[PDB]
Design a protein around this ligand. Structure first.
Ligand SMILES: [Zn+2]
Ligand SMILES: [Zn+2]
Ligand SMILES: [Zn+2]
Length: 585
């Protein structure tokens, strides 16, 4: 018993072919079963034939005879059909409103999440379908991980390197950082966790959470979890106020936070606010300064990743009283300088998925590009707050969508918050990049910030681009451009000061080859997000949708504090780089 995801009409019916078993009202359930392949209907019991060894589960072929359900063949002489009068039978028949179209629900209930159009719909439907879409999608994602073969340690060739035997008749996951495994030790009559791991082509290189002397017969599965049902919306209803509400500004602020005082007042004068902070513009400085501006405010600092919560902790460690802070950790090494798991502390730092049920003066949700509507809903379900501040940058990278293959996901569809920031604009903008040379700031300002991003620094004159397609090879799930690495190696011989550079590419296999040939530290663009280096050498590797994605490119070139060399495949992005062109040797 529950509430029709289309009407809200109370019901005793959930579609049992739908992987999330959403409650459907007599009208909406009926319109659903008749217009799709979904015909299992669940109530107090499941609408299935109770006859001895009968397979009929289709609600349009079933009857309530006695107090059981039967198909045509096995029904008693006295019965009625479960599924007639443009409605399916169940409790609360009389209360039931239905919908003009069930078209959006049907698409969400039945899509396989491989088309961009599936995510576009999930982020433009009614709020209640946004929750059903986010649950349906996360469940589909978690089920897809079970499709992958077990990987087993066949041989231990060295430390940090392994030989893997793969389960037959199941596919193998890509071996990159977006696929975190769990090891397991072979025991008497069961198995125990031995940490979370990542793998990369060698044999395979393994980067584990903890060290071990892991031996043969240890095996790896992408640990999947239970997706809980969602209740709270992606955004609470917006409210604008005429005064600062439920907060009391400090009378003395330091010139270090003075640039944010107007924005801090805007936070206190609406229910939720969006802050777009391009790279190096002071997102975490903003977030911690809010605490100092409203010194009495209880603030929960959340984000999706331990790293993002940790960065907020590292900024708080500088500026806030340590004794007033707590890191929430569920029973991976994260921040260990605050007291642990003290919910009632003034300043709570905690990942979305570990949030306690509590209230707060302000909730700060950082790195919003990386949130899903699933995460947005969970924050609203766990935290009741006077104010919500959503900090991030719809021009940076979203959560990977493992199932997505046909089309690109635009920023307005990353989640509800990113949708607001791309359609109505952000409430607040940090307009001065402090990190990057002016050639990089100007480039991304035009590319993705509608020329609103301003440079603190001068031109470095250490920003270079080279147009070189080279040669692309593919391994199981990545790309390599040896000749592009060749160009970087030749550049390094004529410019050996660049040997302090970090090497960045859109591909782990490109990074693996560059590490061996160049000896630079390597980062995927996706793994460089939030980090900074003096010198960056970027090889585009390919001209794919992945390597040309403007958000990935933005993140790639904004890592550089001083200098950058971009070896480009794509004429388009090459031409948009406001950098000094270099000829090929
Ligand atoms: Zn269904
Ligand atoms: Zn039967
Ligand atoms: Zn309905």
């Amino acid at each position: 018993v529950g509430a029709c995801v289309l009407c809200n009409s109370q019901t005793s019916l959930r579609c049992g072919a739908c992987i999330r078993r959403p409650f459907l009202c007599c009208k909406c359930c009926y319109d659903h079963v008749i217009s799709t392949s979904h015909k299992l209907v669940l109530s107090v019991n499941p609408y299935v034939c109770n006859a001895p060894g009968c397979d009929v589960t289709d609600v349009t072929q079933l009857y309530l005879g006695g107090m059981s359900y039967y198909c045509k063949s096995h029904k008693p002489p006295i019965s009625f059909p479960l599924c007639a009068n443009g409605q399916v039978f169940g409790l609360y028949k009389n209360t039931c409103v239905g919908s003009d179209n069930v078209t959006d629900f049907n698409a969400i209930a039945t899509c396989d999440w491989t088309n961009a159009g599936d995510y576009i719909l999930a982020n433009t439907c009614t709020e209640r379908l946004k929750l059903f879409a986010a649950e349906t999608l996360k469940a589909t994602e978690e089920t897809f991980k079970l499709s992958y073969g077990i990987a087993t340690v066949r041989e231990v060739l060295s430390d940090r390197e392994l030989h893997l035997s793969w389960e037959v008749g199941k596919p193998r996951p890509p071996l990159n950082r977006n696929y975190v495994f769990t090891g397991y030790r072979v025991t008497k009559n069961s198995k125990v966790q031995i940490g979370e791991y990542t793998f990369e082509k060698g044999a395979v290189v393994y980067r584990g959470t903890t060290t071990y002397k892991l031996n043969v017969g240890d095996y790896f599965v992408l640990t999947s979890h239970t997706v809980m049902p969602l209740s709270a919306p992606t955004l609470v209803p917006q409210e604008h106020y005429v005064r600062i509400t439920g907060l009391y500004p400090t009378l003395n602020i330091s010139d270090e936070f003075s640039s944010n005082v107007a924005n801090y007042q805007k936070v206190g004068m609406q229910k939720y606010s969006t802050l777009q902070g391009p790279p190096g513009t002071g997102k975490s400085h903003f977030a911690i300064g809010l605490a100092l501006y409203y010194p009495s405010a209880r603030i929960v600092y959340t984000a999706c990743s331990h790293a993002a919560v940790d960065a907020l902790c590292e900024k708080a460690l500088k500026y806030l009283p340590i004794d007033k802070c707590s890191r929430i950790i569920p029973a991976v090494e994260c921040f260990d300088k605050f007291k642990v798991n003290s919910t009632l502390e003034q300043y709570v730092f905690c990942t979305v998925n570990a949030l306690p049920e509590t209230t707060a003066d302000i909730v700060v949700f950082d790195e919003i590009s990386m949130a899903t509507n699933y995460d947005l809903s969970v924050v609203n379900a766990r935290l009741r707050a006077k104010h919500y501040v959503y900090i991030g940058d719809p021009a940076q990278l979203p959560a990977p969508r493992t199932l997505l293959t046909k089309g690109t996901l635009e920023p307005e569809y990353f989640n509800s918050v990113c949708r607001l920031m791309k359609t109505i604009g952000p409430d607040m903008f940090l307009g001065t990049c402090r990190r990057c040379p002016a050639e990089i700031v100007d480039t991304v300002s035009a590319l993705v910030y509608d020329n609103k991003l301003k440079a603190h620094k001068d031109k470095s004159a250490q920003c270079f681009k080279m147009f070189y397609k080279g040669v692309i090879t593919h391994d199981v799930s990545s790309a390599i451009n040896r000749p592009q690495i060749g160009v970087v190696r030749e550049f390094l011989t004529r410019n050996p000061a660049w040997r302090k550079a970090v090497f960045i590419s859109p591909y782990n296999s490109q990074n693996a080859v560059a590490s061996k040939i160049l000896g630079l530290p390597t980062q995927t663009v996706d793994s460089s997000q939030g980090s900074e280096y003096d010198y960056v050498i970027f090889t585009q590797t390919t001209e794919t949708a992945h390597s040309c994605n403007v958000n990935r490119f933005n993140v790639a070139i904004t890592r550089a504090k001083v200098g950058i060399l971009c070896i480009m495949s794509d004429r388009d992005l090459y031409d948009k780089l406001q950098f000094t062109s270099l000829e090929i040797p």
